[PDB]
Each structure stands twice: as C-alpha cells, then as structure tokens.
Amino acid sequence: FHSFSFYELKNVTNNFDERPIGNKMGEGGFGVVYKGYVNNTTVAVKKLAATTEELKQQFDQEIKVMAKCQHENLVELLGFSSDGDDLCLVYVYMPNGSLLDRLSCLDGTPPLSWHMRCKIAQGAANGINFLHENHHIHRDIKSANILLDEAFTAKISDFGLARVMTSRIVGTTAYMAPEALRGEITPKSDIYSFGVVLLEIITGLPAVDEHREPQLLLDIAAAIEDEEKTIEDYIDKKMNDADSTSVEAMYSVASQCLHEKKNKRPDIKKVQQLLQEMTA
Ligand SMILES: CCOc1cc2nn(CC(=O)N3CCN(C)CC3)cc2cc1NC(=O)c1cccc(C(F)(F)F)n1
C-alpha cells in the first residue's frame, strides 16, 4: 500500500481509455474500472465519479477498512490517488472479472461449471463471514461486487458503503433486503443480498432483467415457494455437471437467506456450514 500520482494512473490506463477489450473493464454508480500496469504487476484502477462530498467519504471509508486488510476472499487495495482532479483506487487485478460477467459469459468466456459455482459460493460466504466477525456490514453484496482471480477464487469488492437507521438509503435495489430499502443498517441485510447472489448462481439470470417476466429474480423464488414452479425449471441450462440434490441444497440456503423477516434469516456462520454440508 502506497500513494500513486494521478498522472501515473492516467499514463498506465492510456489516458483512461473508455474503449473496452482499450482499457475499460467495467463500471458502476461510483465510477469506471480500468486495466493498468504499475510497478511490475497488472492492476485495476477505479476512477471515482458520480455528491462530490459523499464520493470522497466512500473513498476515505474504502481506504480506512482495506488499507491494511488481507484475506483470501476480499480484494487487495494496493493504494490510491487524490493529488489529481479525480479520486482513484488501485487494486490487484482479477483476471476473470465479476461473477455477474462470468454468469453472463461476457466476451465469449465459457459457462462456469456447477463445481466452480459451489466453490465461488463458499468463497464469497467466507468473505462475508470475515467482515461480520470484524463487525463490518458490506451494504452492497451482489454478483458484480464478487470478483474472480487467476484460480476463480471469490473476492468481495466495494467497501465505500461498508459500516441503527439511516437517512440516505444506498445500495443496489435488485439485491437489497426490505429493511435495507427502509434505511435499516444490519448485517442480516448482507445475508439477504447473498441469497439473491445464490439465485443468480443457480439460474445464471441477473437479479433484474427489465425485458424478463418476472423482472426481479426474487419473484422466481416467491413463485417456487408458492408451489407454482420448482427450482428444477430455472437451473442454468449452460451447465452439464449440475445435480438436482446439491442445487436444492444451495436453493434451501438461498430461501432461508431471502426470509422477509430479518431475525428468521441464518447468520453468515450458519450459511457457511450449510454450504460446506452441500459439498462435504
Ligand atoms: C469491477 C469489475 O471490473 C473488472 C472486470 C474485469 N474483466 N476482466 C476480464 C476481461 O476483461 N475479459 C477479457 C477476455 N478474457 C477472455 C477474460 C474476460 C478482468 C476484470 C477485472 C475487473 N476488476 C478488478 O480487477 C478489480 C479488482 C479489485 C477491485 C476492483 C474494483 F472494482 F472494486 F475497483 N476491481
């Protein structure tokens, strides 16, 4: 971890080339992620962009929680830049991008095997466990914020909103718990959001598709629980190694996570155990 010059980060991203394939790898609400090469390693450079004050607060927060953090299932922050006109965060490069992009087979990548999906589910849950052990709430758990390294190891990203009620309601609505949408801040909200990620993994479908019926993946769960559908009907067809048994084990974990009453949901510790029993 050390301070980078804005102009060094500009240089290694070809002046922040927004063309893909180009240096642009992804983007979100809080900025664009660029491929760079600094020191003697390939790096991800997140140039932050929209409130200018809230943006700087999310920047300082990310640094405060991740500056010294090292974990198997969390991204590694290598440094930052605030000396230029734009705020930049620099991470270790995740060559296999986001769980979302790999579930979508973006840029012609092969579909993730059920085996790969199970290990990624366990990894992410191990990442969320470490945060809850250290009394951190993520507040933005989703397939886009689960990155995959050279070995498809799950790495949780985005700690800008990482932390009771609140005034400014923040997060990705497709993944947010009912109480999180009301402004409640609790680690039980992360468990819910993880439940939506498990539905994405089982189905290969994004949490929200405006051109889909139903539009929210949450409804598919609701439809299955009301005996109209079975999970069997929504299992990702782009797999050859998926067994109904272990699929239903993961769906059972997803269902418990997606309980509308926060207190009925399992803790992250119970989620890990149920996901281990799934494979063991
Ligand atoms: C945030 C998603 O951004 C990325 C997308 C990526 N895609 N590809 C692969 C890729 O482009 N292709 C080309 C064709 N081959 C076949 C394979 C797929 C690697 C990616 C790495 C990405 N990000 C990071 O490394 C990263 C790491 C830590 C923190 C962050 C943060 F966002 F928080 F800032 N980002």
Residue numbers in the entry: 165 to 185, 189 to 217, 222 to 334, 343 to 459
Please give sentences taken from the publication describing this entry.
Interleukin-1 receptor-associated kinase 4 (IRAK4) is ubiquitously expressed and is a central regulator of the innate immune system. Upon binding of the respective ligand, TLRs (except TLR3) and receptors of the IL-1 (IL-1R) family signal via IRAK4. In this process, ligand–receptor binding is associated with recruitment of myeloid differentiation primary response 88 (MyD88) protein to the receptor, where it interacts with IRAK4 forming the myddosome. In summary, IRAK4 appears to be indispensable in TLR/IL-1R signaling, and activation of the IRAK4 pathway is associated with inflammatory and autoimmune disorders such as atopic dermatitis, lupus erythematosus, hidradenitis suppurativa, and rheumatoid arthritis.
